[PDB]
Every structure is written in C-alpha cells, then in structure tokens.
C-alpha cells in the first residue's frame, strides 16, 4: 500500500538528452534516430527575445552554426529545419539508445513525467499534470528549456511536452514535440498571462478512490447526488464540470471499491462545503488533482 506522486522511470529518456548550442545560447535537445529536436529560441540572443522573427534569424544560419554534444561526442549537424516552435537538426549519427517512441499531444487533465535537464544532463524527474489552462506547475531554471515530458506504456515512450518558458505567475508553458504550444502562448518575452485555472474534478475523484483503496475512509458518507446537482456545487468551487464520459472512466475504480461514482461525488461535495477540519487524505490537507484514474489504477493495482 501507500500512494505517492510517482514518475515514470526516466532511463529511456535519459539516453536521448543532448546539448544544443547556437552562438552563445545553450539548451537541451532530444536525440531520436538521426534527428535532434529543440526549442527554436536557441537561435535567439537575449535582445532578440522581445519580438524575434524566427524565420529571419534561421535563414541567417547554416548547419555549422549549430553544435550538438552528446556526452563526450560532438554530433555533426547535416541539416536543419523549423516546425512551428521547434528546430529539427538532422545529425550524421542515429542515436543507438533510441527507444520505441511516439509523439502525442495530450489533453488538459492528463499527467506526465518531466525529466529536468541542464546542458544535456538530467537533473531530476517529477510528475506533472497539464492544467486546464494549458500551463504546468513545474520546476524549471535557466538552461532547462528543451527538457521533455513523457509517459511510458509497456516500453514505448510517448513524448508529449517540451519546455519553453515561464509565465509571471511562476507556472510553465511549452509545446508538443511538433512544436505547437499548449494554450495560447507564444515564444517571445512579451506580457502573457495564463487564463484562470480550474481544478480537475475527475482526477480529484480518482484520488479519493485511491484513498479508499488505501484505507482512508473518514470522508465517505451515506449520501448521494445527481450529476447536475454535483456540477452546480463544482461550478461554485471552480471545479471542472463532470461529464458522463468522466463518470464512465471512473467505472473500474468504482467497481473495485464498491462506491458508486455519484456517491463519491456526494463525498466531494461535502468536502468542498465543509473543508477537511484538520484531517488529511493520503497525507494531503488539500484535494489533489494531478492523478488520473489511470494513474490510480496503475499504482494501486
């Protein structure tokens, strides 16, 4: 038993991290087969950063403007192209450590592991959710750009996030591996703000089920509710509406615990209205919303 915010084992991604330097700018890249993926703002200097024209900056570069370092080795860049906000550097050597992999664009509310990296060297690994406002609450410093987020299924790595920037609120923004930003953000140092966030309701419910699986039951009640009355309460507390799709996704957990989904919604409703009153759930005094139902099933088995 026990329930932890658990990341995927990171070795298959560690094998893929490289350093990309253009001019005086160094960040991380992802080396898969004979291609290195990295944020395009590697071709920026610090005063190109308020309003760069990336096409202009890139037409003024050649292959030999880019240095790729894979641990000891230097990789010769033999081609370069831009796809949305990512640069693709074709190198003369296929990564011998390339895992089975996919690129995926995830939906808000889904979780993934981030491998925080600096100068091509992994620093740490932690679990994240894509917030409803398409930011992530990460841990990123200067030089971390190009760090990626991923899920692992069997032994195939689904890459879903590459890190590009930090918003004034301390939260983080980035792209899929095709270079399309999550959310409305753009890669320039202009005034940008995240939209109002909300709490991921289906995930909170999944975590309450994890609590029950692990023997935290003080929050259950004999009550129930309809989806609509629950959603009235949820709107009041800045929770996302609960869809019948969500209720169905919660099916297997409801079945393992014998607690109907709408019964657990009644428990969440009274948790929202009363608070915790000095008690904790799975070691948290807040309602946690960065575990999907699939995370709960995976970890609780």
């Amino acid at each position: 038993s026990g329930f932890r915010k658990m990341a995927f084992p990171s070795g298959k991604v560690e094998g893929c991290m490289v350093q990309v330097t253009c001019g005086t700018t160094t960040l991380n890249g992802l080396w898969l087969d004979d291609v290195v993926y990295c944020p395009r703002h590697v071709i920026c200097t610090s005063e190109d950063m308020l309003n760069p024209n990336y096409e202009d900056l890139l037409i003024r570069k050649s292959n030999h403007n880019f240095l790729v370092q894979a641990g000891n080795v230097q990789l010769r860049v033999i081609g370069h192209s831009m796809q949305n906000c990512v640069l693709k550097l074709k190198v003369d050597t296929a990564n011998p450590k390339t895992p089975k992999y996919k690129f995926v664009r995830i939906q808000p509310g889904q979780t993934f592991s981030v491998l925080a990296c600096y100068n091509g060297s992994p620093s740490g690994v932690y679990q994240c959710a894509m917030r409803p406002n398409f930011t992530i609450k990460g841990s990123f410093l200067n030089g971390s750009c190009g760090s990626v987020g991923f899920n692992i299924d069997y032994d195939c790595v689904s890459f879903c996030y590459m890190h590009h920037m930090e918003l004034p609120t301390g939260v983080h923004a980035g792209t899929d591996l095709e270079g399309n930003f999550y959310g409305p953000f753009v890669d320039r140092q202009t005034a940008q703000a995240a939209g109002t966030d909300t709490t991921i309701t289906v995930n909170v419910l999944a975590w309450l089920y994890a609590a029950v699986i692990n023997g935290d039951r003080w929050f259950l009640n004999r009550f129930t509710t309809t989806l609509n009355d629950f959603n009235l309460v949820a709107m009041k507390y800045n929770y996302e509406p609960l869809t019948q799709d969500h209720v169905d996704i919660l099916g297997p957990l409801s079945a393992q615990t014998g607690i109907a989904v709408l019964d657990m919604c009644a428990s969440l409703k009274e948790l929202l209205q009363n608070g915790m009153n000095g008690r904790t759930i799975l070691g948290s005094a807040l309602l946690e919303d960065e575990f999907t139902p699939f995370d709960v099933v995976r970890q609780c088995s």
Partner: peptide, 5 residues
C-alpha cells in the same frame, strides 16, 4: 513578462 527558459 514571459521569460524564455
């Protein structure tokens, strides 16, 4: 300000 990492 957004800040590129």
């Amino acid at each position: 300000x957004a800040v590129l990492x």
